[model samples]
Target chain A: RVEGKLRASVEKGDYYEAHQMYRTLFFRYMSQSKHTEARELMYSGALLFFSHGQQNSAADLSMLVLESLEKAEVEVADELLENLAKVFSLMDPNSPERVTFVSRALKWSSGGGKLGHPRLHQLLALTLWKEQNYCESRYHFLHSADGEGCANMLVEYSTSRGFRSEVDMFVAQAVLQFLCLKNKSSASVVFTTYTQKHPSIEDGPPFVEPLLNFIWFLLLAVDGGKLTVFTVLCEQYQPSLRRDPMYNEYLDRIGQLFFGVPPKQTSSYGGLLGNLLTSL
Target chain B: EPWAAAVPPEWVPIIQQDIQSQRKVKPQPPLSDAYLSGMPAK
Candidate 1:
């Protein structure tokens, strides 16, 4: 089957060839009203192009998938929203051309549901953060499981000369402390209050519980000077926490503070934190 | 082997031309900023 050949080409990293094969197969399947198969080919082809670093082709194929699905009156899957978010995030965030595309993806994703994937919001949040739109960035970041992204930003926003304020410091402290809390419903409530205090922000999805729980444990142990509590929580959540980008840095930074045991590795947090802080 | 003839005859040249055009334009790495600055892509 041409489908088999297409898969083989992709497996071999012959993306350019596979892209064309995808087009041919897609059209053939589409002609027979096999739209589901056609959509899958296009979706897979887009991912193949993206994996090979062909941004433009990947974006074009992604658009083709979206347009075809819409033309067929199909419900837009969360997967397509995710792919669109990925494609635009890989492009220049500040490019005017990209802004329109991001806007469209966000609208479609949000219209289908209150929010798209947390990762999609995180991508948009980072893009806005890069452009110094901290207010909006914090909004999206709060909705994501990666509250660290916004928490890290608030740390600098509070310390910056012109932007620094008592309120900023307070907000930063709350984020750090909340990250350490086990009860996310409470965190969400407090977070909602902050959003209300500063309008133009959005609410988080229900899926951010684990990160909230993990951060709470660390902060609680740190604040109470309870090394035993810290160690126990660390062991309990190690598997999940290890996957966090900042988890290692957090362990290294706090390992000696709460526990007498020194970290084997230097903290990478300060360098990254310093860069982000200085940039602001 | 059977798949060799699966591509429509007309699509062969179109595919080749498209691939050649893509090759003529240099491809760049995906911007690291989108990933590095935020939560890593899931």
Candidate 2:
């Protein structure tokens, strides 16, 4: 009788009632291990909930379904995760649940090398960056597979803000860390290029000068095989670097890459970075 | 919006299969009301 009412609501496009009943039926189906029915209800429920502006509800239900599928060791179809990610992206970036949803979506998309959702990663990266979650953001932005977009975002935010604004400082930190892993020589090239193009502005920010000088020093250290000392210097300057939240994220990766002592995991990427690389 | 009326095309095949299998008691006919509006008469 209840299923009949639920189907009637769905047929008539009564999303309010449909969502309510679907929520009930979803759990009922799941408790019985009716995977197909649960999946159908989730997909339909999420679409209806989101189209009606119940985005948070949509995200909650979708995450629940995705996690349930994983716990059951069932491989969900790509379209399911794709739609879940789509809804998650439309959500407010400042919402507390946004990070959790994006993290889960990234995990589902990157599914043990069986799949790759670069666009999802990219979207999550931007959202995280906006929320000042710099470390994980940089990781996602690089893996987004659109190096051009990532670089453009770095330069754009860096130039758009005040000379010493928080946003600009983060951009500098991200670009330097990225260049270190991607191309150490390019760090020098970038510094020289920026300096030549904007010579008059070199006197703008004290911290900016030191940050650029630090990059220059890292370049020198790389060339001279003196990274051991460079690493020690970095540790000594940890208090200065901690001024920007994003700097903490890159420190471990940078240290591991240069010194070869495996990085003790940082909270920025948590364990997602390991999953991301291994899945790839 | 035309899109609203077209919202659940994916639901059709599944519903149709259910109808054919006699699993459902009330078979839904083609949707005729404005989807974004309240449900219309049966």
Candidate 3:
């Protein structure tokens, strides 16, 4: 009976009344099996509430929209998910709820697959990436199948966090880490991005830094699928690899997977990473 | 960036893919030219 009155009261600065009435409408519609109506109310309710600066109320309706989507048993797809992204985009970046919201948003998206969806991860990664949240963004990018996003974020992240002495080790960490994920594709991209835009390095393959040279050679070896070249790279760059201790374990895994090199018995170590979080 | 001689011909596709992907997701507020280049004046 009081439809359209919701936005009217909302825009009229009677937000509490609008919120209460919206809750009433949601309950009334939800129990009547009118989940679509409930979803619409909650969805737009969140947007209006957010736009009006009632962020807490907006957040409440935001979660409720997800509840509505669940109640409707809606399939996961960008069409349905797009508005949620809009909702997030409009929300306060510094607002604490973003963490919880994104987690649940991914949960809602994940039923489409156990591993979840790449585009959704890209959405999440790109969101935080825009916010200058590189650490948070990389977590999603690595999972997103968007190697380039991960690579670029990594260059920024490492550059901001790393030292000149530590620079080359940074990309090597990503390269070996990507290879460990069986993602030589990203490994190559990360190496390319870091070296090309690096402040200290002008050129390489013949790079002044032995590590970058090793990485270039390693990528080529991986291309040729040659074990001997791989071993030689490892041998040549032993000092460079030693800068970050975990590179060996990653290479061991990479070799076993990519080149048929049997990994010898090994104890794992985390030297550079152990130091990184100290600064972070 | 041209594929360096260090890259195998077979890796050219992967390198090109990297090029596209890196540019596609390149960071905003583009990197400073001097930041990319070590030489500030030269």
Candidate 4:
């Protein structure tokens, strides 16, 4: 009866109630038979945990399911097993077993007589990167991150093509991180380029943020000096920076440092991050 | 909003199949469209 009610809640999209019911159902029978109603309830709970940012919990429980799959009376074929591998790979990219599992799964998949599957290739790529194979890493990152029509292709070629396997979220994250590195390396490239062109103050807004951030880092690098930090447009920059609490906290910490104020007794690390940003 | 209503059409069938395949007591049908659409945002 509890499982029925929970299923009703889940079907009607009562995720909150569904989650509660899931908890209740799991504990109702601690030894609930594998592949039974209670097991499904627990599976739902695992997915809910993931949506709630309990990533470690979700990944841990997913591993539990894999461990119990053979005992669950459900014989997942190689194809579905590959699906399981992809799902876990995206969720927990840093799992120690991720490499081993993907490698074994690839061997199983390929040796099972299937070939050239996109997911197979992507998994191979992930393994290569983890193993420090940079050339293959570059090759795979290029192919997987920007592979033709990866986003739309997931739904269209879904049955045949296994996506770049979460390329939308996973690969976008990779691409964004790469962009951040590039942006930080030559952060002042734009202003420098423009100044070189115009050779005058009329060049533009003077690229104050990057310039300030750059000087801030340079000054911070020294052992000791009389620190003097002020903004030309306090009202404008202060209000704009206040829009994000992180940026606000950053300025506040930097303020303390510039004025020789001791670090805040609280656990706030905003200033430290600001220092890191400037160093970058 | 339209996406919300449309999701259950795909998801419900899969869930129903899962429940039946597991032999769990399947819930009643004809779920309200609004209820399905108004579930959770994220």
Best by DockQ: 3
Docking class of 3: incorrect
Q: Per-prediction TM-score, please?
A: 0.40, 0.50, 0.71, 0.27
Kindly list the per-residue Cα lDDT of model 3 for residues A128-193, writing each as its tens digit.
778877655765675576777766776776667545455666666667666766777777877887
DockQ of 3: 0.03
**Best TM-score goes to which candidate?**
3
- Candidate 2 iRMS, in Å? 30.0
lDDT of 1 at A199: 26
Q: Tell me candidate 2's fraction of native contacts, as a decimal between 0 and 1.
A: 0.00
Off by over 4 Å in 3: A1-3, A32-34, A92-96, A159-161, A256-265, A269-280, B1-42
lDDT of 4 by residue, A1-280 (tens): 5556655665576666666555555545445553455545565556656666555555554544543443454543556555554445445556665554444444444443433234555555555545544333433332332333222222222222222222122222222222222322222332233233422223333222222222223232221332331222221233322322343333344445445544433544434443423321
lDDT agreement with native, every candidate? 0.52, 0.53, 0.68, 0.38
Clashing pairs in 2: none
Evaluated on the second chain alone, the candidates' TM-scores are 0.42, 0.36, 0.42, 0.33
Quick one: how many clashes does candidate 2 have? 0
* TM-scores of chain A, one for each prediction: 0.44, 0.55, 0.79, 0.29
DockQ of each: 0.01, 0.01, 0.03, 0.01
In model 2, the runs with Cα more than 4 Å from the true position are A1-16, A74-81, A97-100, A106-119, A126-147, A164-171, A176-256, A260-280, B1-42
* Predicted complex 4: CAPRI docking category: incorrect
